[PDB]
């Protein structure tokens, strides 16, 4: 079996690069030296983040970056390749801060993909930056191009692919080609922006890393799991934005591919991607979070799940009240709404009042502070057993995560992921995926194999008539159909032969 990708983000703020040190945790919490040889071997990719697209419409580091210190940090990462011949140090362009619709550099993203000339100049800058700093690939994290910017985004990706494939030949990297990936939406709302052209977006990529997290948060009215694998009927449900994408499909087609409302889960994002033709499962990578989201002012009854709350949803945290008991990291980061798994693990074992609970439908853990009314949704080594089994069962390309500095000091989360995919003595054949809700949509990309008597010319077909014909099973949408399946909108293609 081909090894599953394990893609971890290495994120460092500009000021940390400008004051990089591997000997003062109060200045650089997570220096490159914390990525021991053992951890380097459990990773296949490290996404260095984040670079941006400047006003000159080229890939570039934050202008305030001390270049020499930046190269030194990157060199330290590249040196880890000594312990793992498959390791690739990618760099990520974008991220929410720089590129969301209201982010500071949004216009640059829109403008860089606008014309053949802007695209050429942009694609060149990505490869140049890649070669100059010694990176092994380009990862684009634009959150997210809108419907009109999509064809341009696609041309940009194709252009970068062309240049990278050329660079691979020029550098003798046939054995470890340069790669191209993007962080893709892991939720229908953002996904609906480019969904209709998913095949063209994925074609030039080695992997599309789904951000299947942040699926719940203080901006929503009711608390919920931010990365549930499957759905919980007792949990909130959402409008399936995909049924409104510019697909050109019929009512029937739209309805059967996009049930609404539905459970916003990791399984939903993966299955929605697999519903489209030309989106190979092997390129789909499941993103997981090494952090949890916290809410205050929750009620009792369901251990804090599906409750109203009083947590501010704006960025930055519009207050100075650090109410996440025991979360020291939250005080230094001035935000009690997010906490690394490292910090959560310490809070859990420090007698702070948290009770760890488990939702066996969503297959994810959660914390409930009954005394203060706090709820935290997060992921751990146990939820990763199911996600890892799903990744194997669905034949996905692998896993991705944000971010390395949030794992505990022993790197247990990374180690668990590596174990679930590669340990010869780990056996998950008896691991039960449970009865949580699965995404029920069916599209052109995942039609099931079926059998039905073959269409007989001359027969009058009633409503709901199933006849195999031309390599597909077709069903009539209404009665008195006497036409051949395929050239009358009265027929619905429902299966493969
Ligand atoms: C599933 C979905 O579409 N949820 C949206 C949220 O993602 C989004 O919140 C923002 O998400 C970013 C990561 O995707 C965070 O970096 C950011 O902190 C977070 N909060 C913000 C920007 O206020 C919200 C708001 O755009 O919309 C949801 O629909
Ligand atoms: C590569 C990546 N870009 C996004 C995403 O993963 O999730 C992170 C966690 O919310 C967020 O900080 C970042 O902007």
Whether 141 is in the pocket of ligand 2, judged by its Cβ within 6 Å, is yes
Whether 92 is in the pocket of ligand 2, judged by its Cβ within 6 Å, is yes
How far, in Å, are 90, 162, 295 from residue 358 at the CA level? 35, 47, 17
Concatenated DSSP letters of 187-204: SHHHHTTTGGGHHHHHTT
Tokens in use for 309? 């709350």
Mutation test residue for ligand 1: of 217, 263, 269, the one with most atoms within 8 Å of CB: 217
Residue 495 main-chain phi, psi, to 5 deg:
-165, 165
CB-CB contact of 268 with 262 (8 Å): yes
Tokens in use for 425? 């003595």
Tokens in use for 298? 């929750």
Whether 402 is in the pocket of ligand 2, judged by its Cβ within 6 Å, is yes
Whether 315 is in the pocket of ligand 1, judged by its Cβ within 6 Å, is yes
CA distance 320 to 212: 30
Measured CA angle at 45 (ends 42, 51), to 5 deg: 140
How far, in Å, are 454, 481, 497 from residue 459 at the CA level? 11, 8, 21
Whether 189 is in the pocket of ligand 1, judged by its Cβ within 6 Å, is yes
How far, in Å, are 48, 95, 117, 146, 216 from residue 152 at the CA level? 25, 19, 11, 10, 31
Q: Whose CA is nearest to atom 7 of ligand 1?
A: 214
For the chain, list the domains and their CATH numbers: 1-289+380-447 (3.20.20.80), 290-379 (3.10.50.10), 448-497 (2.10.10.20)
Question: What is the whole-number distance in angstroms between the Cα of residue 491 and the centre of ligand 2?
Answer: 43
Q: What is the DSSP letter of 235?
A: S
What angle do the packed helices 266-274 and 381-393 form, to 10 degrees?
A: 10
Residue 367 main-chain phi, psi, to 5 deg:
-110, 145
Tokens in use for 325? 């008991």
Residue 274 main-chain phi, psi, to 5 deg:
-70, -15
CB-CB contact of 271 with 230 (8 Å): no
CA distance 93 to 56: 15
CA distance 132 to 129: 5
Concatenated DSSP letters of 398-444: EEEEE-GGGS-TT-HHHHHHHHHHH-TT---TT----SSBPP----T
CB-CB contact of 132 with 78 (8 Å): no
CA distance 57 to 111: 7
Question: From which experimental method does this structure derive?
Answer: X-ray
Question: What is the whole-number distance in angstroms between the Cα of residue 399 and the centre of ligand 1?
Answer: 21
Q: Whose CA is nearest to atom 9 of ligand 1?
A: 219
Neighbour tally for 328: CB within 10 Å? 13
CB-CB contact of 109 with 99 (8 Å): yes
Tell me if the bond preceding 261 is cis, omega within 30° of 0.
yes
Which residue from 419, 9, 459, 434 is spatially nearest to 233, judged by alpha carbons? 434
b/e for 52-70, b at 16 or more Cβ within 10 A? bbbeebbbbbbeeeeeeeb
CA distance 208 to 191: 12
Q: What is the DSSP letter of 267?
A: H
The three-class DSSP label of residue 386 is: helix
> Could you confirm whether 143 is annotated as catalytic?
yes
How far, in Å, are 27, 353, 441 from residue 472 at the CA level? 62, 58, 18
In the set 22, 58, 143, 314, the catalytic residue is 143
Atom nearest to 96 CA in ligand 2:
14
Give this entry's resolution in angstroms: 2.0
Q: Whose CA is nearest to atom 11 of ligand 1?
A: 214
CB-CB contact of 428 with 34 (8 Å): no
Which residue from 312, 45, 271 is spatially nearest to 179, judged by alpha carbons? 45
Mutation test residue for ligand 2: of 7, 9, 100, the one with most atoms within 8 Å of CB: 9
Tokens in use for 157? 């990706």
């Amino acid at each position: 079996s081909t090894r599953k990708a394990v893609i971890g983000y290495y994120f460092i703020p500009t000021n940390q690069i400008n004051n990089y040190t591997e000997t003062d945790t109060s200045v650089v919490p997570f220096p490159v030296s914390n990525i021991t040889p053992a951890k380097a071997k459990q990773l296949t990719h490290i996404n260095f983040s984040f670079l941006d697209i400047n006003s000159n419409l080229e890939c570039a580091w934050d202008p305030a970056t001390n270049d020499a210190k930046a190269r030194d940090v990157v060199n330290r990462l590249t040196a880890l390749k000594a312990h793992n011949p498959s390791l690739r140090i990618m760099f990520s362009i974008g991220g929410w801060y720089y590129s969301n619709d209201l982010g500071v550099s949004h216009a640059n993203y829109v403008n860089a993909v606008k014309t053949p000339a802007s695209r050429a100049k942009f694609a060149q800058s990505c490869v140049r930056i890649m070669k100059d700093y010694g990176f092994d690939g380009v990862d684009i994290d634009w959150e997210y191009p809108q419907a009109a910017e999509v064809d341009g985004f696609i041309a940009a990706l194709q252009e970068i692919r062309t240049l990278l494939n050329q660079q691979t030949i020029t550098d003798g990297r046939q054995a470890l080609p340069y790669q191209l990936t993007i962080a893709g939406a892991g939720g229908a709302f953002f996904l609906s922006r480019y969904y209709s052209k998913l095949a063209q977006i994925v074609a030039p990529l080695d992997y599309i890393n789904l951000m299947t997290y942040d699926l719940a948060g203080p901006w929503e009215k009711v608390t919920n799991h931010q990365a549930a694998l499957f759905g919980d009927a007792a949990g909130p449900t959402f409008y399936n934005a995909l049924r409104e994408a510019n697909l050109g499909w019929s009512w029937e087609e739209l309805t059967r591919a996009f049930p609404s409302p539905f459970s916003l889960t990791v399984d939903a994002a993966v299955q929605q991607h697999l519903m489209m033709e030309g989106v190979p499962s092997a390129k789909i990578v499941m993103g997981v979070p090494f952090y949890g989201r916290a809410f205050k002012g929750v009620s009792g009854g369901n251990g804090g799940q599906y409750s109203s709350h009083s947590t501010p949803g704006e960025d930055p945290y519009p207050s100075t009240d650090y109410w996440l008991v025991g979360c020291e990291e939250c005080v230094r980061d001035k935000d009690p709404r997010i906490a690394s798994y490292r910090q959560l693990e310490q809070m859990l074992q420090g007698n702070y009042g948290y009770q760890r609970l488990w939702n066996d439908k969503t297959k994810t853990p959660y914390l409930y502070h009954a005394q203060n009314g706090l709820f935290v949704t997060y992921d751990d080594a146990e939820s990763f057993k199911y996600k890892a089994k799903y990744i194997k069962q669905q034949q996905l390309g692998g896993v991705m995560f944000w971010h390395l500095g949030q794992d505990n000091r022993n790197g247990d989360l990374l180690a668990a992921l590596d174990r679930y995919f590669n340990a010869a003595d780990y056996d998950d054949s008896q691991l039960d995926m449970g009865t949580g809700l699965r995404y029920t949509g069916v599209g052109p990309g995942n039609l099931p194999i079926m059998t039905a008597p073959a269409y007989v010319p001359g027969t009058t077909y009633a409503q709901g008539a199933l006849v195999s014909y031309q390599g597909y099973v077709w069903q009539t949408k209404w009665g008195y159909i006497t036409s051949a399946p395929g050239s009358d909108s009265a027929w619905l293609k429902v299966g493969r032969v």
